[PDB]
Amino acid sequence: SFIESPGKGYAIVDEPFSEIPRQGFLGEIRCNSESSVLSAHESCLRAPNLISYK
Amino acid sequence: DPGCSELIQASSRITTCSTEGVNTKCRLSGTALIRAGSVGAEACLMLKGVKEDQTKFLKIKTVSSELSCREGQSYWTGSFSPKCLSSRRCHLVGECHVNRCLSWRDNETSAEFSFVGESTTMRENKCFEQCGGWGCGCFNVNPSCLFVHTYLQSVRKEALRVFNCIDWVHKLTLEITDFDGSVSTIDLGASSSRFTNWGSVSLSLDAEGISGSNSFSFIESPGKGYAIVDEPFSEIPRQGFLGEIRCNSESSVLSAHESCLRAPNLISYKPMIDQLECTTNLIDPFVVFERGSLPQTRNDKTFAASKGNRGVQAFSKGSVQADLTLMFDNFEVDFVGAAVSCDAAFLNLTGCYSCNAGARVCLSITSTGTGSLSAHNKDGSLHIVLPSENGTKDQCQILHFTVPEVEEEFMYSCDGDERPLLVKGTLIAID
Amino acid sequence: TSAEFSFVGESTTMRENKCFEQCGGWGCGCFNVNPSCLFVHTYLQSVRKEALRV
Amino acid sequence: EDPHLRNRPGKGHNYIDGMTQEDATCKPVTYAGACSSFDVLLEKGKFPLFQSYAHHRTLLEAVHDTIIAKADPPSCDLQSAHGNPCMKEKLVMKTHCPNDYQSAHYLNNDGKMASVKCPPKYELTEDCNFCRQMASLKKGSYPLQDLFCQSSEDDGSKLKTKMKGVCEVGVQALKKCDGQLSTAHEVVPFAVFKNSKKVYLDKLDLKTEENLLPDSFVCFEHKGELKSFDISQCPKIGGHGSKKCTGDAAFCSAYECTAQYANAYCSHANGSGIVQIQVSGVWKKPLCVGYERVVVKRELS
């Protein structure tokens, strides 16, 4: 898996490509564009019941 | 050069007729069994009416002993070229929004490319969110949208029909020479039947039979040669397989019709604000077509092209072991009152002894009218029938012998009377 | 119930009715070239004057 | 089918000698009128073969266009004493026709024009084999077959009917059946070539192509509905003519492109002109191919 950084260098991860955004794994909150992540848009996909309440 | 080899006499059970005003109009109704000849020989079949001179032939020539492959799953494919169009639109302008560009349907046109209209060409529509502000050409800080309208089209002038073979049917190209003189070329496979102007022909027994062909596929080119691919056929269009973009016709490939099928997520898109580059790694079928083109040596057989009907065939190295069933759907066979004479001669003798190929003989027949010429030997074991036309013509059929030094005297007859005739020659050993 | 057997009766008897297809024309007894039919009305009757309680 | 149902190219005459009582509405044949010898041809579920090919001429139209000759007599009397010639050729045909009809034309054996005639006021029956005494009587004839006329120049005199195992099919007699005979009601198509007879065939194979004849092209003028126009006045390439005309690539590829000086907008027909049949393996263009309903007498002995 590769990670692109706009303006900086690249990266590589020694794991296969994630296909299910499950809790407790790298890749549980995904989006569609850069502005959907920087501004936190509702068009992205996240895991259900991820906000802990006390 | 080709001539009859298996000459049998028809029985009187299916042979009848009557004389009406001195005119032998014989009738044939029933079934008959005859053995098919080898490659080069023919299957003669004479008929005896009410006299001896009234005799017509019914020869069937064997062209070759091929093996037609039964076609099951077939499609049309070829080369293509992606043509993508870019049209970046600012945000809050028409259909440019943060929610209308990310989740864009792959089957609906946008307002930017609505000027083309409805078309039968395959295409797809994508939506990409770029950047905004005055740094890329916009008025609002919201990111703009990029409408992509990429359609596929072919750049070649021909196509290929990749199919497979599920069964090898023993096809024999056999012609039928009628009693009047008309020749009709047909075919017989496994146990099929046809329709002629005098009955129905069919095959009773096949020969050999190649098994195991589901893991192979063939390529047919319109007006060109054939090909073979050593790869099993796939029913689903996947990437990296010979047939990722299929259709159903040649026009659907040369023009890229929307009725064809393709694999999802195949066109690689590289959006660059205002630049669009669509590069696809399409598999060129001409590389495999020119790499594995027939003839190709596969096991003991030799796959080649066809010599008649469109379809894959196979050339074998065996003999011909088949039986033909000749029927008669109440056909009228007329005869003359008296046949004409004819003087036969001798030419040459080339062939072999004790083999399925036989040996052809050169006989010069010089007559005047139209009829036949029946010949016999000295013990009634070798019958020779040849057509009789006008002028001097060279005929002769395939003869079988068991001695390389053939010195047997023949007795040919054209209208009833017989004349002596001596033949000679030297035969070779044929396996 | 067949048309050529409705005049017999509808008594309580283990019977059955079939319909076999035959030939047509004047080759066996018909005035039409269409294949004729055969009306079968076979019924079952007793034979012995006593029974057994198996 | 074909969109041109009532529009008939050329003359379009449908009247026979002795029954000239409908020329007011059937000469020519247009969208209006009421021609009894043409309205029954476009009926659904009756003559589909005529509905498939409707751009070509009919039987009477082919007779008036110097294509199909006339028999002797062309219209026999189906009521005259001492017998009549139109009797044996009618009793062997199993066809149906409505009431209030007086004439019923068909095809003979020589490929000419043989028909019947009923003196007024005698009407026909359900089968049409015999007439009888008398709403309103039709002032025309009833087509007993389902054929269309066309112009062809293909010889076929040696292509005689070769129906094996059949004694007498339709009207012609192949031989004299002296032993057994099987009479059945079967449908067998027919075809007529140039200088031949009524040749019967088993299967029917149609073929539709185009050519350069004016009959394969139609045109209409623009004026202040649909208005027909004579397409034969279009000049050729480098020749002469009468009124100009233009069209698309199909119409412009045959005639001369005029456009600016044209008076009408010519178009291309929906596949018509040359209709070939598959007989003896080859392809030949017949003259009056059809699909009638007669009685076939097959053999048995």
Topology (elements, then pairings):
This is part of a larger assembly, with three copies of chain A and one copy of chain D (about 300 residues).
Chain A: E1 2-3, E2 11-12, E3 29-30, H1 35-38, E4 45-46
Antiparallel strand pairs in A: 1-2, 3-4
Chain D: H1 36-39, H2 48-52, H3 59-64, E1 75-77, H4 88-91, E2 115-117, E3 122-123, E4 132-133, E5 166-168, E6 182-184, E7 190-192, E8 198-200, E9 208-209, E10 217-221, H5 249-252, E11 264-268, E12 274-275, E13 277-279, E14 282-284, E15 296-298
Parallel strand pairs in D: 1-2
Antiparallel strand pairs in D: 3-4, 5-15, 6-15, 7-8, 9-12, 10-11, 13-14
PDB class: virus
Keywords: enveloped virus, rvfv, glycoprotein, fusion protein, virus
Entry title: Model of the Rift Valley fever virus glycoprotein hexamer type 1
Distance between the termini of chain D: 44 Å
Q: Percent of residues of chain A in beta strands?
A: 5-15%
Shape of chain D: globular
Q: What is the oligomeric state here?
A: part of a larger assembly
SSE arrangement of chain D, N to C:
HHHEHEEEEEEEEEHEEEEE
Q: Please state the CA-atom Rg of chain D, rounded to the nearest Å.
A: 21 Å
Span of the ends, CA to CA of chain A: 35 Å
Q: Helical amount among residues of chain A, as a percent range?
A: under 10%
Largest beta-sheet details of chain D? 3 strands, antiparallel
Given the structure, what is the number of helices of chain D? 5
Spatially, the strands of the biggest sheet of chain A line up as 1-2
Q: What's the order of the H and E elements of chain A?
A: EEEHE
Biggest sheet layout of chain A: 2 strands, antiparallel
Helix content of chain D: under 10%
Largest sheet: spatial strand order of chain D: 5-15-6
Structural class of chain A: mainly beta
Subcellular location (chain C): Host Golgi apparatus membrane; Host endoplasmic reticulum membrane; Virion membrane
Organism (chain C): Rift valley fever virus (RVFV)
Protein name (chain C): Envelopment polyprotein
Family (chain C): Belongs to the phlebovirus envelope glycoprotein family.
